[PDB]
Write a protein that binds this DNA or RNA. Structure first.
Lengths: 148, 204, 265, 89, 216
RNA sequence: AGAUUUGAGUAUCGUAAGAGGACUCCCUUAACUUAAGCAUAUCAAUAAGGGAAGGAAGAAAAAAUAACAAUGAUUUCUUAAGUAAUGGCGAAUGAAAAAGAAAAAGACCAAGUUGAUA
RNA sequence: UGGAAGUAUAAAUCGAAAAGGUGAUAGUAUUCAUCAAAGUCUAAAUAUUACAGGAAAACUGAUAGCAAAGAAGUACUGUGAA
RNA sequence: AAAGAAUUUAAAACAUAUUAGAUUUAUCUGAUGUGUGAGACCGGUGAUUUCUAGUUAAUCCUUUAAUAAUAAGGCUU
């Protein structure tokens, strides 16, 4: 909306809001990230203190698909099936049917242990598990299943 | 078959028998005109492999080219350039001498179509090739379904556009895969596609 | 934020505008329509396999492939030369990936073959295939009796047991029936092992009203719909340690280096 | 229930299914190889090898091949073929 | 044009000639020589930053917020105070959510019958106001073909089974028809004023619950 | 004298040239500019110069990916992605497999075999 | 070249094979995987600001819009490119 | 020493054994068996993981199909 710009409120003022002493010239210290170590050093130091240098090892052709591993905590497991299914099997135990919360079908490969689980048995099937995730699942009375 | 021994023989170019024949052939070509017609290929095995057929409309032309590397065509070796472009020697042509020689035969013989070319010999100064050419307006070539593809209009001056095997190799079409990322379907066309800034009709 | 804009080259001649986008839709649609008019199952988008995706990130999803392998055509009893002419894609380049891939794509071709109807190569009713199918009709009816009757004897035990388990789950919503069916299934499989079939089945060729369908990959669904899975929680699963099994697998592979160094010293 | 994603025995339990075809020559290639050898002889760089192998300097012969062929494996094969023809004469 | 005003070989004459430093046309023999050049303050030069055809013409809106506004635009059509305030003569209409029989619509095939239906339900007060107050445009827009400027009348919203009665209503001045599924703010709130006088058919009205659902 | 090989002149029937080059395939070692100087770098397959074609051209049927519950010619679009990487590691430059679609199609030479051989 | 102990091309020298290439950190070895180079053609989906014929426009309205709304690349200038 | 059924019918690589047709060469080319490579246990076997005490080995991370000795790259000073 060019009628709402500041140019329409500065029609009449000579300098168009840029000053009389310090004019509005072409450059204000270079073109781009110029002077990263000379006259803009106090800027890079202040706001990007690790901009210059090297760190870590080079990966010549990284495989970003190999680091793909979506994760879900234990407190978010029962949402994968719903609160209505959870209440249906609330009073189950060992011996009768218990819902299987598979996570690969929903797109989660690893299960982590954070938060709390409802005090019901459950069968959690996933590719990877955490040490504290399996404790919380087994303490509630459930099982851990691997995949792939 | 006769040609399974000629092919095996021709790979022994360092042998005395083949070095003698190459020595005599290069002497004769050093005195005949630069581009001239020979009756039959001196390497009938290699000519047949590249596409030569002993039928009407197939002709063979010998071209002699001065190998080595030339200087940058700057007067008195003076170029007004930054030191990153001031070299005069050691700059190699991108097109192989085979593709360079094919164009000269094609320009000289503008009414024919260049099929392919193969290597004959070389000396301290020259390198000699033989070029397979086809007459596209011969009735035999037109009426043969397996070879009448040469009669298409886009085959006019095949080697100049870069369609012959010698010329296509200089374009980068020697293989496939991640080694040839920049020469997918043409280096310049591939470069333009990667540099396109697509501005969709509805964009954020 | 340190800006990273690659506009220092000539971007103005690099700009591609999509003003032709609303007109590409009309153009492609009109050609799709015209293709079906010309020869209708040419746009049928010839049937394609159900291949998995690559990498562990995608391997649990099925997707349409390109052409069935020559082993999948033999398993489904289809001539590879006739396959390309009845809207089946063929890919001799693909090597078979697994037995399960071979089985899954074998039923994909079998299901397609039953649905397929091939019109005669000559419309006139005196075409050979129409004449032959009338000539050998009495032999087919005689053959059909043997196939029907000796199918009806081999599946007597399996069919009866399969009814029991179906009703057992109905009343329960069981253990005894499942053991019975499992024990029967082993014996049937072991009986088949202890054997020469048709090389090629017949092409279904008949005269019918032309109901034209624009594709076959949307008719034969890749995967069956998914539902909630529930299992019987037993003492065995309650004590299985998944973390210990993962660290054992990780450490065993990392221990193959020390094994090789130990021998060479 | 569904293997494991780590280790040597990693992967979904399935039945993987390809023939390791061998690209080679026939029995007649012996004749063509020998006939061409008589009609041609040995290159300049092969003959120098044949002298070194005669003197028993096998390591120096391999170093000479590696220079003129550019591969350790191709140099080994050339050093084998040259010494095989040495025992023929 | 991307080469408009920049089609000269002009360079500045420098200083020392008692003329400004703006670039000047080269050569002699015409009055054009020695004149101004590319600069936007000069005559026959390029303007300020020339307009480029790759601007952002079309805009993007989230789909849910597009549907939020349509429901608010449909809901406002049932308020006679807002429908009248938009400029619609709805004094004589029986009910403000005017719904007509689907059997009556199915027999409409001519514009004489479509007009008859509009008169019966007292909707012709709006149709006649557009007819009586049609005028001509005021400005340069007439050179571009936009001459006649008409007002807005009733909107006829039909269903899938009322596809043959569209041809009857389309020639009536200031009567725009639409389908119940293809509704948008461009019909329901023309000029960004809400409360269009909508005439529903039986099928479209009975489909509104399927299309939009309820608050539960 | 005869049988061939090679190279010419002439006659007949044809073929190339010139225009255009917006888009297509290539050759060539520009510089202004940026880096607050500047010398590698950037501008930049960019400008100019040169050649060749069509209604499209180029590419096209794996000496290809991948390390998987695996794929499968070429082309184009979405995403990966301003990412891996490159760089006075400065300014800056900068992909591809996977995955989602448009369209889909495979065929021949040479080598080998058959020779009362055609 | 993004390709980093060399991604591609070319030149000088060298130059294979009872085959072999690739798995981007150079090297040797043993396995594994996947292909089988050094000849040719191939529609469809894609591009287009030459030029021609049409249709549209929140475009300009005679110092604007093409340089050109009239016998406009015309009148006029230069030896000439222009 | 204490806790553990382990998932379910369409198969090619050929290490091989045995024959058939040819070859002399750094010799091969077809087909028939077998195991490999197989996986459906009947409260109890137990494949499998854990714990303790020894003993042998390997141990800072990476070179992305797996290892090895050189080499190179990481991290801290």
């Amino acid at each position: 909306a060019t009628r709402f710009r500041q140019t329409r409120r500065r029609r009449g003022h000579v300098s168009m809001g840029y000053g009389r002493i310090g004019k509005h010239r072409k450059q204000r210290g270079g073109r781009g990230n110029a002077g990263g170590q000379h006259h803009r050093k106090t800027w890079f130091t202040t706001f990007h203190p690790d901009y210059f240098g090297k760190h870590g090892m080079r990966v010549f052709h990284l495989k970003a698909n190999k680091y793909y591993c979506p994760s879900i905590n234990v407190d978010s497991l029962w949402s994968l099936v719903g609160k209505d299914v959870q209440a249906q099997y609330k009073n189950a135990k060992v011996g009768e049917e218990v819902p299987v919360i598979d996570c690969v079908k929903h797109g989660y490969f690893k299960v982590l242990g954070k938060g709390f689980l409802p005090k019901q048995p459950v069968i959690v099937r996933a590719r990877y598990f955490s040490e504290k995730a399996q404790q919380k699942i087994k303490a509630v009375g459930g099982a851990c299943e691997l995949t792939a | 078959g006769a040609y399974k021994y000629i092919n095996a023989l021709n790979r022994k170019k360092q042998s005395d028998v083949l070095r003698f024949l190459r020595r005599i052939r290069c002497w004769e070509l050093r005195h005949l005109p630069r581009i001239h017609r020979v009756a039959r290929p001196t390497n009938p095995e290699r000519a047949r492999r590249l596409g030569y057929k002993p039928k009407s409309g197939f002709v063979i032309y010998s071209v002699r080219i001065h190998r080595g590397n030339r200087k940058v065509s700057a007067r008195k070796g003076i170029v007004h350039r930054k030191p990153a472009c001031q070299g005069i020697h050691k700059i190699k042509r991108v097109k192989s001498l085979q593709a360079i020689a094919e164009q000269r035969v094609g320009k000289h013989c503008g009414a024919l179509r260049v099929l392919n070319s193969y290597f004959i010999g070389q000396d301290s100064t020259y390198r000699f090739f033989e070029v397979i050419l086809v007459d596209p307006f011969n009735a035999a070539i037109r009426n043969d379904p397996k070879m009448n593809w040469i009669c298409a209009d886009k085959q006019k001056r095949r080697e100049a556009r870069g369609l012959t095997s010698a010329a296509k190799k200089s374009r980068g079409f020697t293989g496939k895969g991640r080694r040839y990322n920049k020469i997918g379907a043409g280096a310049r066309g591939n470069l333009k596609r990667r540099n396109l800034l697509q501005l969709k009709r509805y964009r954020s | 934020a340190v800006s990273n804009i690659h506009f220092c080259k000539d971007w103005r001649s690099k700009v591609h505008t999509w003003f032709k986008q609303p007109f590409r839709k009309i153009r492609r649609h009109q050609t799709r329509v015209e293709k079906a008019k010309a020869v209708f199952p040419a746009t049928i988008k010839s049937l394609k396999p159900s291949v998995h995706c690559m990498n562990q990130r995608f391997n649990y999803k099925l997707r349409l492939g390109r052409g069935f392998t020559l082993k999948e055509l033999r398993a489904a009893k289809i001539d590879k030369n006739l396959a390309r002419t009845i809207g089946i894609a063929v890919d001799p380049r693909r090597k078979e990936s697994s037995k399960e891939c071979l089985n899954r794509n074998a039923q994909r071709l079998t299901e397609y073959m039953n649905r397929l109807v091939v019109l005669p190569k000559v419309h006139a009713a005196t075409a050979k295939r129409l004449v032959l199918n009338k000539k050998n009709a009495e032999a087919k009816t005689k053959k059909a009796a043997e196939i029907k009757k000796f199918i009806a004897e081999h599946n007597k035990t399996i069919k009866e047991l399969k009814i029991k388990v179906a009703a057992a789950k109905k009343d329960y919503a069981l253990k005894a029936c499942l053991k019975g069916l499992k024990k029967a299934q082993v014996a049937f499989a072991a009986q088949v092992a202890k054997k020469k079939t048709k090389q090629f089945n017949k092409l279904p060729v008949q005269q019918k009203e032309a109901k034209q369908v624009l594709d076959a990959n949307k008719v034969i669904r890749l995967t069956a719909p998914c539902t909630l899975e529930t299992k019987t929680l037993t003492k065995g699963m309650k004590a299985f340690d998944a973390v210990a099994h993962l660290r054992k697998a990780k450490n065993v592979a990392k221990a193959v280096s020390g094994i090789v160094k130990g021998q060479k010293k | 229930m569904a293997g494991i994603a780590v280790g040597l025995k990693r992967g979904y339990p399935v039945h993987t299914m390809t023939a390791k075809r061998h690209y080679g020559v026939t029995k007649r290639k012996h004749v063509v190889n020998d006939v061409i050898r008589e009609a041609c002889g040995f290159s300049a760089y092969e003959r120098h090898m044949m002298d070194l192998l005669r003197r028993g300097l096998d390591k120096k012969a391999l170093k000479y091949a590696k220079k003129h062929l550019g591969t350790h494996k191709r140099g080994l094969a050339k050093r084998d073929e040259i010494q095989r023809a040495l025992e023929a004469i | 044009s991307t080469e408009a005003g920049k089609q000269h070989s002009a360079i500045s004459w420098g200083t020392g000639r008692a003329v400004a430093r703006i670039p000047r046309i080269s050569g002699s023999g015409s009055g054009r020589n020695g004149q101004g050049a590319f600069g936007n303050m000069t005559r026959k030069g390029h303007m300020f930053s020339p307009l480029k055809n790759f601007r952002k013409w079309q805009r993007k809106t989230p789909k849910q917020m597009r549907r939020f506004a349509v429901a608010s635009c449909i809901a406002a059509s049932a308020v006679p105070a807002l429908v009248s305030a938009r400029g619609h003569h709805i004094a004589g209409v029986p009910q403000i959510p005017l719904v007509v029989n689907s059997k009556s619509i199915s027999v409409i095939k001519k514009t004489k019958q479509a007009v008859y239906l509009l008169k019966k339900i007292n909707a012709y007060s709006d149709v006649l106001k557009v007819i009586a107050s049609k005028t001509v445009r005021a400005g340069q827009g007439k050179m571009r073909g936009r001459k006649i400027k008409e007002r807005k009348g009733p909107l006829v919203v039909y269903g899938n089974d009322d596809l043959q009665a569209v041809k009857a209503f389309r020639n009536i001045p200031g009567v725009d028809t639409c389908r119940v599924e293809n509704l948008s703010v461009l019909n329901l709130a023309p000029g960004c004023h809400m409360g269009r006088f909508i005439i529903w058919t039986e099928s479209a009205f009975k489909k509104l619950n399927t299309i939009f659902g309820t608050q539960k």
